[PDB]
Amino acid sequence: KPSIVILGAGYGGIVAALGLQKRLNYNEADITLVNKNDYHYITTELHQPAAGTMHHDQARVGIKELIDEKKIKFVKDTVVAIDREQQKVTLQNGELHYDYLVVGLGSEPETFGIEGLREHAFSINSINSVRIIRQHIEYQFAKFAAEPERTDYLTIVVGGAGFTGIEFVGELADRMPELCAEYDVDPKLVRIINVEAAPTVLPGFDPALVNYAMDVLGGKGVEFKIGTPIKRCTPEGVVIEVDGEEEEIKAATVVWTGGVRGNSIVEKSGFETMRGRIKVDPYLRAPGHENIFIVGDCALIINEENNRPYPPTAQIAIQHGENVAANLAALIRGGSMTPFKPHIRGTVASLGRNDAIGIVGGRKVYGHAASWLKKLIDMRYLYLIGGLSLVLKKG
Amino acid sequence: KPSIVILGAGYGGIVAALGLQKRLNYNEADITLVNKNDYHYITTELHQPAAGTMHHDQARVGIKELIDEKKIKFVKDTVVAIDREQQKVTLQNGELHYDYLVVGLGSEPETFGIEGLREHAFSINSINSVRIIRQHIEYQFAKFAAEPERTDYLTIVVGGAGFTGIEFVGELADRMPELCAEYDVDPKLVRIINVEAAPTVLPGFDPALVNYAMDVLGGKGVEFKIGTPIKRCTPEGVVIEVDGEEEEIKAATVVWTGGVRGNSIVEKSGFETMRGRIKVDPYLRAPGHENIFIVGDCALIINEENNRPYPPTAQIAIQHGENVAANLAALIRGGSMTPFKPHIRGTVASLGRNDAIGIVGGRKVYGHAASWLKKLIDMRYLYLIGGLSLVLKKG
Ligand SMILES: Cc1cc2nc3c(=O)[nH]c(=O)nc-3n(C[C@H](O)[C@H](O)[C@H](O)COP(=O)(O)OP(=O)(O)OC[C@H]3O[C@@H](n4cnc5c(N)ncnc54)[C@H](O)[C@@H]3O)c2cc1C
Ligand SMILES: Cc1cc2nc3c(=O)[nH]c(=O)nc-3n(C[C@H](O)[C@H](O)[C@H](O)COP(=O)(O)OP(=O)(O)OC[C@H]3O[C@@H](n4cnc5c(N)ncnc54)[C@H](O)[C@@H]3O)c2cc1C
Predict the structure, then answer these.
(1) CA separation (Å) from B215 to A114, B48, B222?
(2) How far apart are CA A290 and CA A153, in angstroms?
(3) Which of A108, A342, A143, A345 lies closest to A252 in space, CA to CA?
């Protein structure tokens, strides 16, 4: 009986696990799934609870509730390192030995050594961290009525106007009315400032969408500062460079959405990595190891359409999962492996709960329609992992 | 009658014991403290009596004087082994059974298998042993006037230019003028030689301090031999490797400060150890034993923030103590445990009685100032274990 160890119950790991579970049956292999928490979180929805537009329990689901415990042994613990030579994974409260290893430990923030950013800005990357953001923001608003001079309490800076930054400010902007009512704040004093170093918002995207987004978000009070890098970050706010000169923004809340890297454990375990990620072979294995598969944000894959990396996304992470599960079953039953074939469909960026932009099936989409697509597309994933029960449970 | 046994009345054990004492009331548990001597010694001060710069009684205090006998039963005896299966500790003059076990048996010298080092060099590691070093040194100086050819009587070799080695040579150097006057010795003949295998003095420290230290100590007659390992040790001195030549140093006194390891009783009792130490779980317990806590130099903890182990220090040992005491009180009361968090502040290395280097509150410090900080910092611990009575009793 071979031992399969899956590190990380995120998009990659969970999907890998649930695949193995459908593809094998009892006693074909040992399958141990390791996650730091006993829940799996819908990472792509985390911007909502961060802003408080959706309760966090809707963006997580219990792992035991998803799996067949006869088929998969679930371990709640925190990975510390990987010994490749000895095929041991060292946990915080024990060790595990594997024949096959699947690594899906996701991303960590990248602050590019920008001063203070690490210590003094928040990140949207877990359930814990979004509850902290959400409550931090509400606390600032509560403090305001008693110190109406401190408009900095009402100023929220979001670093990076990429996909995540936009989604987050959109959620913030929807929420402001309710928030201002709860705490007797004059809406006109609130400042949501999205600060991007590059010359445009959503650098890399179709300008038609960018402009539509800027228009909607500007229409709800979002200010954009473009071509504007963050020189440093403090408990009081950020310092930016405008026209080669330092200007301060006083902001009681600063959130960084400006960059991610491969979970650092991969590098520290001695794999060769680019920006913390592994450039995998065509079956998603780590170079040098015919028995180690890397999934999700830990994996780097070059796109053949251009010659640029594929970006780290849930969409591709899910696909990594399905592939590794199929290919591992093959390995186990002396079947054959199929190399990985990313089929990247389109994505939609939400703009608050009622509006959205995206390119689906080659075609641009907006507003109520775009919103529904995203929701539908996202429901596909729930269905994938928990069937109708789950799709309904998000009811 | 939950039986708590604490093995070793050093920084970890004593502080654990005095915590339990404050946190529990009568008959909540049996607390037995075991130590080989009926005194507890201030290990961090032992370099002074070793050189004779401070009487040894100032670096020890009676255990009974510190504890409440109604709360804690003190046993003077010597641990021989631990039976995990039986939950029995074998003493030299009896046995003890435990429900909970706290291990704080401190360090033993690490000689890295170097020939003779164990049998022919001294260690600064107890009150007994510093008295022996001190009286050994004085005896050599007394012998000299009657055999002026034997300048080896005036040669003292200190192995290791780490924290301890530097502190010791600094003490030796302060003391030399008095020692030469007592025994009619020509100062210019005295040789204090600090021999380090690594390529620098104080490897791991800020060079600004290193250089300042080398300057002060060189100014007082300390010679440094760096990148120079000790090939062997004999009653007549040490053999070292210079370039590739084995070169002898004739020295009537040799002291090893070059390395420590976890007390050997831990390994021989069958716990898995790295360098004699246990890699404890987040509540300081030995992996596989939910009822055994390890403290002080027996415990190994990795610095997530450099991925290298924390060094074995009194500072962290004290903190282990407090945590184990809190957590045990919890366990006794069916409560829940708080995991451990090292808060490592800064340390000062003395350089004789009137000079010192260190980093405190992020900032470097030297001379008279540095000296006072260390003295104050060290009084905090006395206060911690014996209040103002003690701080005064050392005054
Ligand atoms: C706000 C936001 C919106 C996004 N929206 C989209 C989108 O709309 N479409 C899209 O394609 N992508 C989107 N993404 C990106 C997508 O979320 C990620 O690429 C995807 O989550 C990567 O999946 P993963 O399984 O590699 O890692 P993650 O989803 O990050 O999962 C990692 C898992 O491992 C666990 N873990 C990590 N380290 C340890 C450790 N040391 N020990 C034990 N457990 C550990 C974590 O708890 C977690 O369960 C978004 C990201 C964010 C932040
Ligand atoms: C010269 C010197 C200077 C130092 N300076 C500093 C400093 O400035 N700052 C700092 O943080 N650290 C310093 N240290 C380190 C510090 O001394 C140790 O980290 C610390 O003593 C460890 O505490 P502990 O209680 O684990 O062990 P110890 O202090 O070694 O106490 C162990 C106890 O166990 C007893 N014992 C051992 N074996 C047995 C047995 N078999 N039976 C019964 N009893 C036993 C001993 O009597 C002793 O009471 C210094 C050490 C030295 C030698």
Answers:
(1) 37, 21, 9
(2) 53
(3) A143
Q: For residues A321 and A262, give the distance between their C-alpha atoms in angstroms, rounded to a whole number.
A: 17
Q: Please, are residues B212 and B201 in contact by the beta-carbon 8 Å criterion?
A: no
Strand, coil or helix: A363:
strand
CATH number of B1-395: 3.50.50.100
Query: What atom in ligand 1 is closest to the CA of residue A312?
Result: 19
A189 phi, psi to nearest 5 deg: -90, -15
Catalytic residue chosen out of the listed positions B45, B108, B167, B171: B167
Quote the minimal CA–CA distance from A28 to chain B in Å: 29
Contact B280, B339 (CB under 8 A): no
Burial A174-202 (b: 16+ CB within 10 A, else e): bbbeebbeebebeeeebbbbbbbbbebbb
- Between CA A186 and CA B134 the distance in angstroms is 76
- Determine the distance from the C-alpha atom of residue A33 to the mean position of all C-alpha atoms in its chain, rounded to a whole number: 20
Taking an 8 Å cut-off on Cβ atoms, the answer to whether B287 and A93 are in contact is: yes
The answer to whether A142 faces chain B, any CB pair under 8 Å, is no
Chain A touched by B309 (CB under 8 Å): no
Q: Tell me, using a 6 A CB cutoff, whether residue B358 lines ligand 2.
A: no
| Residue that has been written with the tokens 């030297």 in this structure | B366
**Cα A107 to averaged position of ligand 1 atoms, centre (Å):** 6
Q: What is the resolution of this structure in A?
A: 2.5
| B215 C-beta neighbours (distance < 10 Å), count | 9
* Tokens 């507003």 belong to residue: A367
Of B287, B302, B307, the CB nearest to A94: B287
- Binding-site residue positions of A for FAD: 11-12, 35, 41, 43, 79, 263, 297, 314-315, 374
Q: Compute CA distances A374 → A238, A354, A360, whole Å.
A: 33, 11, 10
Q: What DSSP element (H or E) covers B31? A: strand B30-35
Instruction: For strands A237-242 and A245-250, give the pairing.
Output: antiparallel
Classified as helix, coil or strand, B303 is: coil
For B:275-294, CB contacts with A below 8 A are 281-282, 287
